[PDB]
């Protein structure tokens with residue numbers, strides 16, 4: 001039936017059998033099909049792509065073409081009528097710290113990226129879309145609905161570009177369009193070390209033979225490292241404040257500076273790597289540069305898997321955790337570890353956990369300075385507020401003592417993100433993440449809300465009343481039914497997120513199913529999972545079993561007062577113990593007698 005496959009834009013896969021370590025590109029993880037779970041390959045399709053013309057065009061591209069008998073609503077109208085809200089009062093999640101939201105975006109970034117197609121440089125094309133809002137080819141501008149306020153102050157549209165696709169880049173005619181995942185499907189720290197060897201190498205400090213990641217030589221943080229700047233122009237970290245002139249950081253993943261707290265968690269990770277390479281040298285002084293780099297890199301990957309799977313996933317999935325992620329039973333080579341396309345949308349539930357402000361806290365966790373609390377939008381691509389305003393320590397305190405936004409059926413995505421997002425290469429703090437998301441679903445040819453309900457063994461509502469019983473909400477159901485004339489057409493993103501939260505979790509049934517399934521594949525089909533026998537020594541695993549974000553903080557900042565359960569709401573000083581009483585990552589198990 002289907003062809004052996006397509007693969008013009010990839011090199012060959014030459015695999016070293018003996019090698020202990022993972023590749024930067026992900027390749028060679030799975031031996032029977034080595035390209036499974038590797039960067040620059042097409043996202044997996046758990047269900048046939050759904051496209052206007054069943055090839056590449058997205059629904060909503062042709063006025064005349066409908067989906068299931070009806071026209072799909074404009075992404076911004078859905079955004080305005082359903083996703084928005086004015087009152088930031090009473091929306092904080094009482095039992096989740098703001099680190100919960102942050103750890104989410106880190107893991108998502110480690111897992112997937114589908115960057116747009118590059119026609120922009122040395123071409124007017126990118127400004128042709130913005131300026132006259134002409135939909136063509138890649139340019140798929142997000143139009144404003146009639147009653148939109150932005151019509152008056154911004155124009156007729158929000159620029160938008162279709163994501164890049166495999167066997168690229170002018171349209172081809174045979175199979176449906178498949179977008180690219182430009183990072184490795186494996187929870188492997190790709191966001192710290194890179195997914196391309198070309199970048200992986202640059203990021204490294206090769207000068208000395210100590211296997212350290214390269215750091216900033218222009219600025220420090222109390223004798224603590226900063227990520228190196230990325231001296232590429234134009235830079236949005238420079239554009240948001242042309243007086244301070246501070247470039248964006250250079251990390252393993254392209255999007256590290258998008259918001260100051262992501263940039264922050266990125267700074268914590270780099271350090272933990274360096275701190276580890278230094279510790280290893282000391283125990284195994286005879287180790288060469290590469291070994292220190294590799295062994296350290298290996299440890300940090302284990303660290304993220306434990307945190308994400310032991311501490312994070314259970315509080316996201318809760319009651320559904322065990323249903324989809326039963327305890328480890330070992331590597332299975334028949335498990336597809338590739339990230340599926342819809343997961344890159346399911347995982348965006350995190351957008352409703354982002355709150356309107358960010359604070360900096362002093363040593364008694366009190367407002368640090370006159371403008372300690374800041375509006376989120378002034379922080380997109382804001383790098384100067386870290387270097388020219390006291391560094392990470394104060395921001396990492398806010399991550400521990402503040403709360404994440406709770407998902408709310410009447411209060412979904414905060415305006416900081418819904419009206420004021422800043423997108424590089426554009427000039428204004430006036431974009432909508434919600435609209436984008438919806439437009440992206442359409443761009444990826446995503447199947448409707450009910451196909452996914454069907455895919456998960458859940459009911460498939462066909463009427464208003466049907467939808468109300470599923471969402472447990474009359475007015476939400478009424479609004480969706482009005483815009484979408486049938487559930488079958490509700491874009492998965494807004495669909496999955498409209499479902500109420502499963503008890504003890506922070507997502508509904510549909511997302512618990514889609515997320516749960518992906519993460520289980522991510523663990524089970526990974527030849528290098530930290531717990532998979534033979535990857536680490538029996539003793540090393542026991543050592544790793546004690547890791548904690550608290551510990552990661554204590555070891556890489558001068559914060560000496562942390563909670564024990566970093567992801568839950570914790571107030572100071574009651575829920576805050578001294579760092580001394582927190583387990584360490586004793587690295588003794590790594591000694592290597594040469595004799």
Ligand code: HEM
Nearest residue numbers: 101104105108112113114259344347348349350351354440
């Ligand atoms: C600003 C932005 C954030 C915080 C202030 C933010 C945050 C998150 C969290 C907390 C997530 C998970 C719990 C999460 C998931 C995904 N995001 Fe989102 N994000 C901010 C801004 C963006 C922008 C811009 C995009 C691009 C959207 C597009 O289609 O162009 C974005 C995406 C995603 C995304 C998809 C990744 C992929 O596979 O391409 C998540 C899975 N975020 N974000």
Ligand SMILES: *[C@@H]1O[C@H](CO)[C@@H](O[C@@H]2O[C@H](CO)[C@@H](O)[C@H](O)[C@H]2NC(C)=O)[C@H](O)[C@H]1NC(C)=O
Nearest residue numbers: 240241242243244245378382384385387388389
């Ligand atoms: C641009 O960055 C500069 C540099 O930090 C910010 O300027 C500082 O802000 C206050 C003054 O209100 C001072 O505490 C710093 O010393 C200032 N530095 C300088 C050189 O003025 C400025 O606030 C930022 N501008 C914007 C629009 O974000």
Ligand SMILES: *[C@@H]1O[C@H](CO)[C@@H](O)[C@H](O)[C@H]1NC(C)=O
Nearest residue numbers: 205207208213214215216217
């Ligand atoms: C590389 O390592 C050496 C030795 O630790 C250090 O002095 C130097 O600053 C580092 N260079 C970079 C760019 O990190």
Ligand SMILES: *[C@@H]1O[C@H](CO)[C@@H](O)[C@H](O)[C@H]1NC(C)=O
Nearest residue numbers: 329331332333334335336524
């Ligand atoms: C391995 O994966 C295949 C396909 O997902 C599955 O049928 C099989 O049950 C798995 N092996 C184990 C031990 O579960």
Ligand SMILES: *[C@@H]1O[C@H](CO)[C@@H](O)[C@H](O)[C@H]1NC(C)=O
Nearest residue numbers: 094095096315565567568569
């Ligand atoms: C808070 O969350 C933790 C998990 O992080 C849970 O064990 C605890 O019971 C929760 N508290 C409440 C009031 O639900």
Ligand SMILES: O=C(O)CCc1ccccc1
Nearest residue numbers: 254255256257258259424
């Ligand atoms: O281009 C960037 O670096 C920011 C774009 C971005 C950032 C974080 C998540 C998705 C997209």
Ligand SMILES: [Ca+2]
Nearest residue numbers: 110184186190
């Ligand atoms: Ca990865």
